[PDB]
Amino acid sequence: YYRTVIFSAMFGGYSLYYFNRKTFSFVMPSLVEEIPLDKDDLGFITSSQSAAYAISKFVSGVLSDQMSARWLFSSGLLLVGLVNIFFAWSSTVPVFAALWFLNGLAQGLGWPPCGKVLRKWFEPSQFGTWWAILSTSMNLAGGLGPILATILAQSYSWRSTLALSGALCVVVSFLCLLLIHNEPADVGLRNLDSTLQELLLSPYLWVLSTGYLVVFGVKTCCTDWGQFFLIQEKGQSALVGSSYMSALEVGGLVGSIAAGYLSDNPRHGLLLFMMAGMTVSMYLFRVTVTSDSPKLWILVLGAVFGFSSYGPIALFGVIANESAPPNLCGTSHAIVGLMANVGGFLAGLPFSTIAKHYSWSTAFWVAEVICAASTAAFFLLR
């Protein structure tokens, strides 16, 4: 009962976080077709997102210890709602970047509160499977996102499918003020149960962190820019690219679910085969797609990318728990997430700068060669 509500008001709550952390990506074609923006401008917006999400992710890991988790989750969800409402009324790129920077700060203040809630309602042996099911909320939101964004944006507006999402997040924030609970002892339901500088100077954390940097950077490149690659170079329509995002996130659902079965260091080999599959799938996506190339192929390549991108994200999370000491394990996850969103910042603005200064094909060549160089450098370290 309480563990059903505590996970349905969050799985349906954090999907209205990830549906709005990528809602600039979901209505990217209408935003570019209506008003002209630089690719540096779009990369500047999504890099303000990634930098703000880095800073707020790293500070909210301490704010979970200082401050409660239902209050930060509800307040950040209401802030995301107000941000997207003002983002639909706004029209120019500096205020786009400012409101999307506030969206990055708001998105950072909500996911470690989900960590504190799910850490204090389930057994510590069952942290992993409920974390995986809550991490499939990103795949669910990004799977149902761009299809709705295209089928509503062609019919009404991008501003209308931002205002509806903002109002929905305000309504579910007023719901999450009252649905979830931070501590079961507040309602009385039988509550259950330096070395830092060595951890910053431990080599396995840096290898894990640059690996999750390059995996989250390649995933952020391919997610936030693959549909735009298909529209502006490969001649696909906006529907094909939005369905490519959707097939990427359906493949990510299958990946982050079947990263739990296939894990149960022998996990490192599964992880490296899966990153090699990511590099080979992105090479096929850079070469083999064509105007004459069918839609079913590009959905299969999206699914094979997602099965090989969110898969190593889930395995990197599992290894980042297992390599962390139990006294200050949240600091290790904060360092890993900070390097992840440094990878997201590298995926936002310098990637689009490489895109508009050489080519989109050269941009995905840069992303494919840094993913291939990382997979080759990780085939050598083991």
CB of residue 291 to ligand A1EUP, shortest distance in Å: 37
Q: In terms of Cα–Cα distance, which of 215, 212, 322 is closest to 264?
A: 322
Piece of the chain touching ligand A1EUP by CB under 6 A; list 150-158, 161-169, 236-244, 317-325: 317-325
Considering the complex, state which of residue 3 and residue 119 has its C-beta at the smaller distance from ligand A1EUP. 119
Considering the complex, state which of residue 110 and residue 145 has its C-beta at the smaller distance from ligand A1EUP. 110
- Round to whole Å and give the CA distance between 345 and 169: 25
Site for ligand A1EUP in 95-114 (CB under 6 A): 111-112, 114
Considering the complex, state which of residue 83 and residue 114 has its C-beta at the smaller distance from ligand A1EUP. 114
DSSP string, 49-71: HHHHHHHHHHHHHHHHHHS-HHH
The widest CA-to-CA distance across the chain, in whole angstroms, is: 63
Site for ligand A1EUP in 336-355 (CB under 6 A): 336-337, 340
* Sign of the torsion angle spanned by Cα atoms 91, 94, 97, 102: negative
Considering the complex, state which of residue 318 and residue 367 has its C-beta at the smaller distance from ligand A1EUP. 318
Q: Are 80 and 171 in contact (CB under 8 A)?
A: no
CB of residue 118 to ligand A1EUP, shortest distance in Å: 4
| Letter string b/e over residues 31-43, b meaning 16 or more CB atoms within 10 A of that residue's CB | bbeeeebebbbbb
Q: What does the DSSP 8-state code read for residue 327? A: S
Q: In terms of Cα–Cα distance, which of 104, 102, 137 is closest to 118?
A: 137
Tell me the residue type at 18: Y
Does the protein bind ligand A1EUP through residue 210 (CB under 6 A)? no
CB of residue 35 to ligand A1EUP, shortest distance in Å: 32
CB of residue 13 to ligand A1EUP, shortest distance in Å: 12
List the one residue from 87, 96, 121, 131 that touches ligand A1EUP (CB under 6 A). Answer: 131
List the one residue from 80, 134, 205, 299 that touches ligand A1EUP (CB under 6 A). Answer: 134
Tell me the residue type at 362: T
Q: Are 306 and 255 in contact (CB under 8 A)?
A: yes
- Round to whole Å and give the CA distance between 255 and 182: 30
- Helix (H) and strand (E) counts in the chain: 18, 0
List the one residue from 108, 110, 115, 277 that touches ligand A1EUP (CB under 6 A). Answer: 115
Does the protein bind ligand A1EUP through residue 317 (CB under 6 A)? yes
CB of residue 114 to ligand A1EUP, shortest distance in Å: 4
Piece of the chain touching ligand A1EUP by CB under 6 A; list 30-38, 194-202, 248-256, 329-337: 329-337
CB of residue 208 to ligand A1EUP, shortest distance in Å: 9
Q: Are 366 and 354 in contact (CB under 8 A)?
A: yes
Q: Are 374 and 75 in contact (CB under 8 A)?
A: no
Does the protein bind ligand A1EUP through residue 10 (CB under 6 A)? no
Q: Are 97 and 52 in contact (CB under 8 A)?
A: no
143 phi/psi in degrees, rounded to 5 = -90, -40
CB of residue 293 to ligand A1EUP, shortest distance in Å: 34
List the one residue from 31, 238, 248, 320 that touches ligand A1EUP (CB under 6 A). Answer: 320
Q: In terms of Cα–Cα distance, which of 223, 199, 171 is closest to 323?
A: 199
List the one residue from 58, 67, 90, 119 that touches ligand A1EUP (CB under 6 A). Answer: 119
Q: What does the binding site for ligand A1EUP look like in residue numbers (CB under 6 A)?
A: 111-112, 114-115, 118-119, 127-128, 131, 134-135, 317-318, 320-321, 333, 336-337, 340
